[PDB]
Symmetry: C5
Subunit: 205 residues, 5 copies
């Protein structure tokens, strides 16, 4: 592990702190959602609770290295606190997000970072009609809180939310779940605003 210690030392100790993206050096964050369970619906406050994992991927030149210079190390694990991470936020939460997984990322020699936090989110949704056959739809937008599209571009690898881990005995079954990039401009202002819309149609099982 001499090499791994050296690599991490070189990237984090013997280097200045990365100050985040800018208009001159933008970055693309790829988002994907894996939905585990709709745990709870509150029809008296219009709040729905969702447990899901949020795959985040991005690439920084300042996290690149040549494996040949570090004993053929091609990737490593590190605390998410040791590196810059994007400020992706649910735009319609009603409680602080609860983190269900360790805050550790994987960094690869090409400078890519993968970070998959598991979370429980309460967000605004009217569940009226959930008890019917057609079910009910709601949506929650995710995006940067402080960075516009000039600094952080969002995208997805697919529009289909991963349902392969959805709890088989959930009180609610997922009829449909998509994740879609949206770009909006406003007339006042030059900068685009980008978000990913997670739209889920579900009903009582």
């Amino acid at each position: 592990q001499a090499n791994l210690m050296r690599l991490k030392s070189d990237l984090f100790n013997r280097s200045p702190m990365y100050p985040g993206p800018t208009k001159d050096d933008p970055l693309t964050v790829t988002l994907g959602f894996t939905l585990q369970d709709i745990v709870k619906v509150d029809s008296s406050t219009n709040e729905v609770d969702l447990v899901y994992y949020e795959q985040q991927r991005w690439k920084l030149n300042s996290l690149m290295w040549d494996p040949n210079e570090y004993g053929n190390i091609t990737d490593f694990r590190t605390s998410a606190a040791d590196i810059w991470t994007p400020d992706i936020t649910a735009y319609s939460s009603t409680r602080p997000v609860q983190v269900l997984s360790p805050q550790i990322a994987v960094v690869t020699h090409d400078g890519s970072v993968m970070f998959i936090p598991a979370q429980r989110l309460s967000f605004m949704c009217d569940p009226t009609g959930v008890d019917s056959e057609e079910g009910v739809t709601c949506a929650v937008k995710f995006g940067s809180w402080v960075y516009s599209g000039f600094e952080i571009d969002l995208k997805t690898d697919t529009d289909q939310v991963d349902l392969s881990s959805y709890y088989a005995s959930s009180k609610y079954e997922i009829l449909s779940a998509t994740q879609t990039r949206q770009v909006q401009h406003y007339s006042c202002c030059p900068e685009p605003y980008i978000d990913v819309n997670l739209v889920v149609k579900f009903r009582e099982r």
Copy 2:
């Protein structure tokens, strides 16, 4: 990039910690509220829960720089923990405020700082009459906890609360929402006390 790292280093590492405003060097904080949702009303304890964003703006000379000296950088993002922030507080909360957004601010070359925390607040309100057509009104004052008007002056850019992001399917519809600066004096003391009164009239949809 190199310039942004140098700029931040110069402003935060190679400079002393700003000790807050004083009577000799006062500052103006501009507040605006964007109301997302009246989530919940408890008629048995007279508490209402509100999700909103609070736009805060102010300007410090010690955060000024000349863009020409730093590769034409006109603004940057930084953790709210790295800079001084005003102690704006709801005066009639009944629980600690829950923060729903990343604590990151934007700092501009003229020394202006923008910080828009999303929050959920429980505050004192009697919701009696909410189920009627005329609805119900309540109010909450915001202001500095420890600074008088000689140190921190508050103001608003408008008296109208921004309702453009209010949840369309909330259990409650906003009939009216204003934000107004008030100045008060006490007999003992020469210094004015300033707050912003957020007043919201709402009812069941």
Copy 3:
């Protein structure tokens, strides 16, 4: 702010940490309560919830300075963590106190410190009779947890609790609210124990 930075540097960096009061160097803390709201009563667990602010005042010689030596600065604000604060505690709480205000204190050139934390407290009270006209009384003692009267003396500026901010549309109306210093001596021990008894008589409005 050059002077304020120098003053704070001189008082906190270029000085040893104040180790708290002792029998040889005692101190007096003045307490006053402002009661905002009796938020909740639980008659099935005998717990009452109170929102209030607790004004605390004391004076330390080691926080004195001459204004003429520091650009006529007569006072400043500082984080409550930077200074010693007294360990005043409710003696009959049933949950951790929730802090509703920034932890910032005001220090004046004579060495006086003001600190006014807003708090929500759950404490032991049997609310039986609250629904009647005569109402119900209960009480909670506040005092130091670790210091006797030889080290920390408590007092009040008045026996009347400040009710001027009591929520007009609270579910409960305050018939009476007092704050009284009490001394107790024990046979074993020479040192007195001091507390302030907050007594509140209230009923359903």
Copy 4:
């Protein structure tokens, strides 16, 4: 306070961190309980909530000093975070313990330390029969989580569980309370395992 500052500096800054007790240098921790209130009983989950103070005493040679060398100071108060504390744990809690008091300890020149945290504990208890005259008994064991009796010896000081502060208007009255040391040996192993059993018989008042 020059001497107190020097004493604390000498004991904590100019000294290495105490690494905890060992078989060669064992430690006795005395425990005593003061029961304030049985706040709540949940007969649907078999959980009972208790508010109490837990007096903890022990002695470290590395906290000794000669009063003559420090202006006749015989004791002082300090944050519990500044000193080693024993890992005494309730063995049958169902929630994290809630601390209701300041975390401050008293250290005396002979190296003794007193620490009396106030706590609310949820622990496993079947309250069936609590509504009858005979009441119900349950118990909670306290002991070190990682130290055997070769490193930490537990004991109790007073005869009795202190009921002198028990809330007079609690929903539950204490019929009886004991605290007793228990020592267990296993065939495999030479080292004894020690706990203190708090046993409380109570009923509805």
Copy 5:
């Protein structure tokens, strides 16, 4: 105590931070569960709460020492924060795990580390049939969040969950409780993925 201070200084201060396991230097973590109580079942959200201890064991060469070089010290206790710990996570939790015990580990001269955190976990389980004689089964998988089987190998010392500490008066009795290692290979990828499946069959007592 001189030796223990020296040993700890040598292992933690005068040694580089262990960067975690890799494919070249893998690690085996042994897991065992002790189940204390099924505290709660929510049939309306399909969540079950478990209080249990999770015994974790592993071995690092960089924590080895020769007892003869350190006054025959064969083991010591240290804060879990001072050492690397594995990122073992419940894969179907619905809330953050609550820690019920001190975060302290035991390190032995052969470089083995024992860490037994007590925890309360909420996880996904349909309790339908719990009130019948046959009872109900559910399961939760534990494993590394970021490490594959090439870096962290999991195993158990026994398939039987330790029920010797199960609360005798729990609302639920355990009919059966097992812990089993499972290996999954995927077609895309050479690396195995490993978890331990805790399966519990229980019913109302």
